[PDB]
Scaffold this active site. Structure first.
Site, PDB file in Angstrom:
ATOM      1  N   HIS A  67       0.601  -1.287  -0.305  1.00 23.91           N
ATOM      2  CA  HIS A  67      -0.101   0.045  -0.113  1.00 23.91           C
ATOM      3  C   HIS A  67       0.758   0.898  -0.492  1.00 23.91           C
ATOM      4  CE1 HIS A  67      -3.443  -2.957   0.658  1.00 23.91           C
ATOM      5  NE2 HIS A  67      -4.320  -2.157   0.190  1.00 23.91           N
ATOM      6  N   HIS A  71       1.960   1.859  -5.793  1.00 30.41           N
ATOM      7  CA  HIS A  71       0.113   1.151  -5.916  1.00 30.41           C
ATOM      8  C   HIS A  71      -0.429   2.889  -6.189  1.00 30.41           C
ATOM      9  CE1 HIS A  71      -2.857  -0.259  -4.713  1.00 30.41           C
ATOM     10  NE2 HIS A  71      -3.189   0.867  -4.425  1.00 30.41           N
ATOM     11  N   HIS A 105      -5.015   7.767  -2.662  1.00 28.80           N
ATOM     12  CA  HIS A 105      -6.486   6.814  -2.383  1.00 28.80           C
ATOM     13  C   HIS A 105      -6.010   6.133  -0.979  1.00 28.80           C
ATOM     14  CE1 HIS A 105      -4.911   3.442  -5.417  1.00 28.80           C
ATOM     15  NE2 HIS A 105      -5.742   2.964  -3.685  1.00 28.80           N
ATOM     16  N   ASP A 106      -4.827   5.925  -1.244  1.00 24.82           N
ATOM     17  CA  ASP A 106      -4.244   5.387   0.213  1.00 24.82           C
ATOM     18  C   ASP A 106      -3.190   5.923   0.741  1.00 24.82           C
ATOM     19  OD1 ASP A 106      -5.386   2.509   0.196  1.00 24.82           O
ATOM     20  OD2 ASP A 106      -4.233   1.984  -1.506  1.00 24.82           O
ATOM     21  N   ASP A 216      -7.918  -0.277  -8.518  1.00 27.95           N
ATOM     22  CA  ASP A 216      -6.947  -0.441  -7.021  1.00 27.95           C
ATOM     23  C   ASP A 216      -6.475  -2.005  -7.233  1.00 27.95           C
ATOM     24  OD1 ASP A 216      -6.130  -0.179  -4.235  1.00 27.95           O
ATOM     25  OD2 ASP A 216      -8.304  -0.601  -3.895  1.00 27.95           O
TER      26      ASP A 216
HETATM   27  C1  LIG Z   1      -7.167  -6.578   0.215  1.00 21.62           C
HETATM   28  N1  LIG Z   1      -6.829  -6.451  -1.295  1.00 21.62           N
HETATM   29  C2  LIG Z   1      -5.350  -5.703  -1.068  1.00 21.62           C
HETATM   30  C3  LIG Z   1      -7.067  -7.662  -1.186  1.00 21.62           C
HETATM   31  O1  LIG Z   1      -7.739  -8.608  -1.837  1.00 21.62           O
HETATM   32  C4  LIG Z   1      -6.219  -7.813  -2.627  1.00 21.62           C
HETATM   33  C5  LIG Z   1      -6.078  -7.059  -3.712  1.00 21.62           C
HETATM   34  N2  LIG Z   1      -4.978  -7.596  -5.442  1.00 21.62           N
HETATM   35  N3  LIG Z   1      -5.316  -8.946  -4.561  1.00 21.62           N
HETATM   36  C6  LIG Z   1      -5.018  -9.998  -5.668  1.00 21.62           C
HETATM   37  C7  LIG Z   1      -5.853  -9.215  -3.052  1.00 21.62           C
HETATM   38  C8  LIG Z   1      -5.690 -10.236  -2.682  1.00 21.62           C
HETATM   39  O2  LIG Z   1      -4.890 -11.639  -2.956  1.00 21.62           O
HETATM   40  N4  LIG Z   1      -7.105 -10.748  -2.048  1.00 21.62           N
HETATM   41  C9  LIG Z   1      -6.742 -11.895  -1.611  1.00 21.62           C
HETATM   42  C10 LIG Z   1      -8.200 -12.391  -0.776  1.00 21.62           C
HETATM   43  C11 LIG Z   1      -8.825 -13.436  -0.183  1.00 21.62           C
HETATM   44  N5  LIG Z   1      -7.861 -14.187   0.294  1.00 21.62           N
HETATM   45  C12 LIG Z   1      -8.086 -15.542   0.334  1.00 21.62           C
HETATM   46  C13 LIG Z   1      -6.979 -15.879   0.373  1.00 21.62           C
HETATM   47  C14 LIG Z   1      -6.255 -17.103   1.119  1.00 21.62           C
HETATM   48  C15 LIG Z   1      -5.289 -17.305   1.745  1.00 21.62           C
HETATM   49  C16 LIG Z   1      -4.432 -18.099   1.972  1.00 21.62           C
HETATM   50  C17 LIG Z   1      -5.881 -19.100   2.747  1.00 21.62           C
HETATM   51  F1  LIG Z   1      -4.864 -20.071   3.328  1.00 21.62           F
HETATM   52  C18 LIG Z   1      -7.174 -18.757   2.529  1.00 21.62           C
HETATM   53  C19 LIG Z   1      -7.268 -18.158   1.572  1.00 21.62           C
HETATM   54  N6  LIG Z   1      -5.659 -15.623  -0.513  1.00 21.62           N
HETATM   55  C20 LIG Z   1      -6.696 -14.092  -0.221  1.00 21.62           C
HETATM   56  C21 LIG Z   1      -6.556 -12.686  -1.431  1.00 21.62           C
HETATM   57 MG   LIG Z   2      -7.192   1.510   0.200  1.00 23.64          MG
HETATM   58 ZN   LIG Z   3      -5.638   1.231  -3.341  1.00 27.51          ZN
END
Ligand SMILES: CN(C)C(=O)c1cnn(C)c1C(=O)Nc1ccn2cc(-c3ccc(F)cc3)nc2c1
Ligand SMILES: [Mg+2]
Ligand SMILES: [Zn+2]
Length: 314
Positions: A67, A71, A105-106, A216
């Site tokens: 963040h 970004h 935005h962040d 985002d």
């Molecule tokens: C908030 N932000 C920045 C984002 O969501 C965001 C923005 N870009 N990206 C690519 C993300 C992102 O990777 N999100 C997520 C959302 C749900 N998850 C659940 C798991 C998971 C990991 C291990 C496990 F054992 C069980 C589940 N990993 C994620 C990752």
């Molecule tokens: Mg944010």
């Molecule tokens: Zn952001």
């Protein structure tokens, strides 16, 4: 006149949605100014105020894994690509406001979710009950705009100034992923009943909201190596928050537990299916030239499935 110019590769490739802004921090201000001059116009801002504003914004981003300043510029660049490929759909004030909104935005992000701040009982949770960090980001934007020599909208009337700050406030608040689910549902129903109306300001607000989500999350729309390497930075923050949740004696959710790292590929799969694919699907329906974002999202979804089948490492 003094016209910002980019090297030959950057000049061509910045027009592509999957552009990576590169590892040279000192080039990012120039890359942003260039995008403002082409998406908005060379007369949108005084160059001296815009440069002063850019550097103050940079100083109020923190040295965090994801963040961060990179970004901010990355998100602005995705907004650039959307604006350039949909140039007849947006207003003079929207071009002025939206790149600034993305850059800001962040602002002052410490790498922690709204949930951690609530559980931690951080003062910001007392000040802003919902969209805690996002209301903080907007407040930080107002502070910087109000520094001496930083009013980049100084040529706008009072009423135009208020409109653009309202575009920026709503765009920044939309980056609260908790609000994205409701916003996308409304847009999906509106598109599928043929009731969506871009001349409706409450509808414009929702479309810009979706654009802000799409920008985002745009790491999922880069080439696979950028996508994979950015995911390490995202998890570096998630795992630090999980450590912090454990310190408060609270079980972190799985994505925030560094012990659950072997399940990351399946978590990514869940995120592409529940959040990303629907997001860029609804965006493509409304702004068909944003198609390359969805195509690149599907390509990376396939890459994560290859990681799950043991045909790729992470
Ligand atoms: C908030 N932000 C920045 C984002 O969501 C965001 C923005 N870009 N990206 C690519 C993300 C992102 O990777 N999100 C997520 C959302 C749900 N998850 C659940 C798991 C998971 C990991 C291990 C496990 F054992 C069980 C589940 N990993 C994620 C990752
Ligand atoms: Mg944010
Ligand atoms: Zn952001």
């Amino acid at each position: 006149l003094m016209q910002f110019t980019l090297p030959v590769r950057l000049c061509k490739e910045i027009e592509l949605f999957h552009f990576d802004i590169g590892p040279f921090e000192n080039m990012w201000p120039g890359i942003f100014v260039y995008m403002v001059h082409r998406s908005c116009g060379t007369s949108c801002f005084e160059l001296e105020k815009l440069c002063r504003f850019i550097m103050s914004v940079k100083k109020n981003y923190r040295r965090v894994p994801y963040h961060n300043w990179k970004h901010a510029v990355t998100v602005a660049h995705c907004m650039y690509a959307i604006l350039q490929n949909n140039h007849t759909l947006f207003t003079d004030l929207e071009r002025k406001g939206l790149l600034i909104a993305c850059l800001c935005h962040d602002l002052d992000h410490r790498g922690f979710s709204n949930s951690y701040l609530q559980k931690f009982d951080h003062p910001l949770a007392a000040l802003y009950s919902t969209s805690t960090m996002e209301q903080h980001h907007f407040s930080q934007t107002v502070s910087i705009l109000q520094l001496e020599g930083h009013n980049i909208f100084s040529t706008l009337s009072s009423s135009e100034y208020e409109q653009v700050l309202e575009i920026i406030r709503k765009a920044i608040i939309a980056t609260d992923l908790a609000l994205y689910f409701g916003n996308r549902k409304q847009l999906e129903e509106m598109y599928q009943t043929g009731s969506l109306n871009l001349n409706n300001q409450s509808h414009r607000d929702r479309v810009i909201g979706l654009m802000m989500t799409a920008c985002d999350l745009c790491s999922v729309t880069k080439l696979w190596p950028v996508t994979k390497l950015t995911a390490n930075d995202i998890y570096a923050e998630f795992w630090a928050e999980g450590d912090e949740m454990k310190k408060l004696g609270i079980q972190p959710i799985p994505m925030m537990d560094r012990d659950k790292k072997d399940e990351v590929p399946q978590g990514q799969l869940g995120f592409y299916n529940a959040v990303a694919i629907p997001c860029y699907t609804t965006l493509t329906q409304i702004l068909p030239p944003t198609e390359p974002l969805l195509k690149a999202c599907r390509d990376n979804l396939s890459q994560w499935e290859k990681v799950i089948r043991g045909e790729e490492t992470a």
